Swiss-Prot record, chains A, B, C:
<keyword id="KW-0546">Nucleotide metabolism</keyword>
<feature type="binding site">
    <location>
        <position position="98"/>
    </location>
    <ligand>
        <name>substrate</name>
    </ligand>
</feature>
<dbReference type="InterPro" id="IPR029054">
    <property type="entry name" value="dUTPase-like"/>
</dbReference>
<dbReference type="GO" id="GO:0005829">
    <property type="term" value="C:cytosol"/>
</dbReference>
<dbReference type="GO" id="GO:0000287">
    <property type="term" value="F:magnesium ion binding"/>
</dbReference>
<dbReference type="GO" id="GO:0004170">
    <property type="term" value="F:dUTP diphosphatase activity"/>
</dbReference>
<feature type="binding site">
    <location>
        <begin position="71"/>
        <end position="73"/>
    </location>
    <ligand>
        <name>substrate</name>
    </ligand>
</feature>
<protein>
    <recommendedName>
        <fullName>Deoxyuridine 5'-triphosphate nucleotidohydrolase</fullName>
        <ecNumber>3.6.1.23</ecNumber>
    </recommendedName>
</protein>
<dbReference type="InterPro" id="IPR033704">
    <property type="entry name" value="dUTPase_trimeric"/>
</dbReference>
<comment type="similarity">
    <text>Belongs to the dUTPase family.</text>
</comment>
<dbReference type="InterPro" id="IPR008181">
    <property type="entry name" value="dUTPase"/>
</dbReference>
<dbReference type="GO" id="GO:0046081">
    <property type="term" value="P:dUTP catabolic process"/>
</dbReference>
<feature type="binding site">
    <location>
        <position position="84"/>
    </location>
    <ligand>
        <name>substrate</name>
    </ligand>
</feature>
<comment type="subunit">
    <text>Homotrimer.</text>
</comment>
<keyword id="KW-0479">Metal-binding</keyword>
<comment type="function">
    <text>This enzyme is involved in nucleotide metabolism: it produces dUMP, the immediate precursor of thymidine nucleotides and it decreases the intracellular concentration of dUTP so that uracil cannot be incorporated into DNA.</text>
</comment>
<comment type="pathway">
    <text>Pyrimidine metabolism; dUMP biosynthesis; dUMP from dCTP (dUTP route): step 2/2.</text>
</comment>
């Protein structure tokens, strides 16, 4: 199911030195996000670094949100995951998309400029209207 | 998109010493959940503690669920995340909402009473009816 | 809400030595997935192992995806979570479902054959059609 989402490019490397995000296939659930870096960042075991994407989105529809997830292989094989574990992007967030990258393993890992380092999915969300009860 | 959800308050501090959960804005995807504690809890690196919220919900609609996520800043900047990483709340769960708080970093952190320590989103869910095949 | 999903069994132990996945109740959001193992696997603190399920699904609908999550108790009480934290299954994935199991705690844990070790939810997903703007 498709939804138009505004995207703003913040760094001129985007598109020029690595591509914009695209779905691998029409059956893909997520979009891979790439590290927008002047220089490679070497992450020792246990450390966290904030990696820019050079991108901002504005979802705008309050019935939609995005969730940022680790990449499967990076996480399983290399211990490279997200420092906030899963990163929620609200419909009114219009700042740069930033990736909290955490090395949860025992091996150092260097993030190269342009490397795919997380994925993003778009999911419908609901806002609860709470009904206060004193017994269910 | 809005959905009525029953909520029961379990601890008289809720509302009295810190507020009920509310959406920051009409475009917010998540609700911040606060620690309902008699005393602050100091979490050393690597440890996990179970924090009550003083709240129970009963979603009741089987086409909806809630997911509990870390807060972005706490997770990235402070290494304070969830011990179960993401916590799924089923439509028929009517117990207290409990937060597994894990210090995944290298600095001790004290959870103050009333402090926002996780977020909750409501998402539609589907139940699979499996169709057994012996080749796709 | 129900959706037909094709499932293929890859290992003859499935159904014979432990059951196929089922929803506990009609209000359950997730399905527990079991370890399909010839022998128990003992996971020391910090290590990760790739556990087969003996199962493959083919969601096929591009408006649906699955997310693999830790079990709540395993994660909170035992530090047994997913090495990729959350595992996304695309609508066109038709390989075996594999579970990255990570011991994020301080106690060794042995995964027994047939033991429930993760959960899977099915959620609607949206594919973004990006609209390039140079200011929001």
């Amino acid at each position: 199911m498709m939804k138009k989402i505004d995207v703003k490019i913040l760094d001129p490397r985007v598109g020029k030195e690595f591509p914009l995000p695209t779905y691998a296939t029409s059956g893909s659930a997520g979009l891979d996000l790439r590290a927008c870096l002047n220089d490679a960042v070497e992450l020792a075991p246990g450390d966290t670094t904030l990696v820019p994407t050079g991108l901002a989105i504005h979802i705008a529809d309050p019935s939609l949100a995005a969730m940022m997830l680790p990449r499967s292989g990076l996480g399983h094989k290399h211990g490279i995951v997200l420092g906030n574990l899963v990163g929620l992007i609200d419909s009114d967030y219009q700042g740069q998309l930033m990736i909290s990258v955490w090395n949860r393993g025992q091996d150092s890992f260097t993030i190269q400029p342009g490397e795919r380092i997380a994925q993003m999915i778009f999911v419908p969300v609901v806002q609860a209207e709470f009904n206060l009860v004193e017994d269910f």
